[PDB]
């Protein structure tokens, strides 16, 4: 089974009103499990399963590391600003790190940064080098070639990352592997009969889902408009697909919902 650990960092000059200028959120298999920001100045648990399987030593440790990370990213904003000839203004540094244990058992590792929403640097484990995407990242690559950073990250991506990912998956095996069935609703709108048909799946877990419309059995997908998959507050997911039909063709259309919690695909009509 595919498992992922992601650490997602945003440092910003203009957050803004009432909001923190630095946030770090950790995810396990897409589920938010740790959180830090520059107002709390505390690394904090976000699922019940991580809270139960960690003591204060772990959160004291993560707090110091992320507090130092915050300071590193304060410096980062100032340094990149100079390299880009910028003054003041609205700017962001983004850092993504983590690992995947794939179904075939293989490990993948990520370490990448973006400046003002554009690729800045990426680690290339194959070649074992930091790639600079723009000239403004070449001095960073220089820094990593000298400081002996590359080996310290190999350790992280190939050992620490994966070992803890395996732990975390273990801590919340039941939570991560759970199934929540969607409540599905079909709704039709506009004119004489029944023009636009809506299919909404509410509150499903896990995230993957295929919702499609069938006109007399035929998948009209190049025709379907989808919202993609969006989150609810409680950790479940949401999705809507619409399709345009001639008024009074309502009876011809069927919504098909494929999801891991449904042993047979679910089939819904307009009332």
């Amino acid at each position: 089974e595919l498992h992922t650990l992601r650490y997602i960092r945003t440092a910003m000059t203009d957050p803004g009103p009432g909001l923190p200028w630095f946030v770090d959120v950790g995810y396990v298999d897409g589920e938010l499990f740790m959180h830090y920001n520059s107002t709390a100045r505390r690394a904090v648990p976000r699922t019940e399963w991580i809270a139960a399987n960690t003591d204060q030593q772990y959160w004291d440790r993560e707090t110091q590391i992320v507090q130092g990370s915050e300071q590193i990213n304060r410096e980062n904003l100032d340094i990149l600003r100079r390299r880009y000839n910028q003054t003041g203004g609205s700017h962001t540094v983004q850092w993504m790190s983590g690992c995947d244990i794939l179904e075939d058992g293989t490990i993948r590792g990520y370490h990448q940064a973006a400046y003002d929403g554009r690729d800045f640097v990426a680690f290339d484990k194959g070649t074992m080098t930091l790639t600079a995407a723009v000239p403004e990242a070449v001095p960073t690559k220089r820094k990593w070639e000298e400081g002996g950073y590359a080996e310290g990250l190999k350790q992280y991506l190939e050992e620490t990352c994966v070992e803890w990912l395996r732990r975390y998956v273990e801590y919340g095996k039941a939570e991560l592997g759970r199934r929540e069935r969607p409540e599905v609703r079909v709704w039709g709108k506009e004119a004489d009969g029944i023009l636009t048909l809506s299919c909404r799946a509410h509150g499903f877990y896990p995230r993957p889902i295929v919702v499609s419309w069938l006109k007399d059995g035929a998948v009209r997908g190049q025709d379907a408009q989808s919202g993609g998959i969006v989150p609810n507050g409680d950790g479940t997911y949401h999705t809507w697909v619409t399709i345009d039909a001639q008024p009074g063709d309502g009876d011809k259309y069927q919504c098909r919902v494929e999801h891991a919690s449904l042993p047979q695909p679910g089939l819904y009509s307009w009332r």
Binding site: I72, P139, T140, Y156
Partner: peptide, 10 residues
């Protein structure tokens, strides 16, 4: 766990 801070320095 997260990584050593230094590894986020540009």
């Amino acid at each position: 766990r997260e990584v050593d801070e230094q590894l986020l320095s540009v």
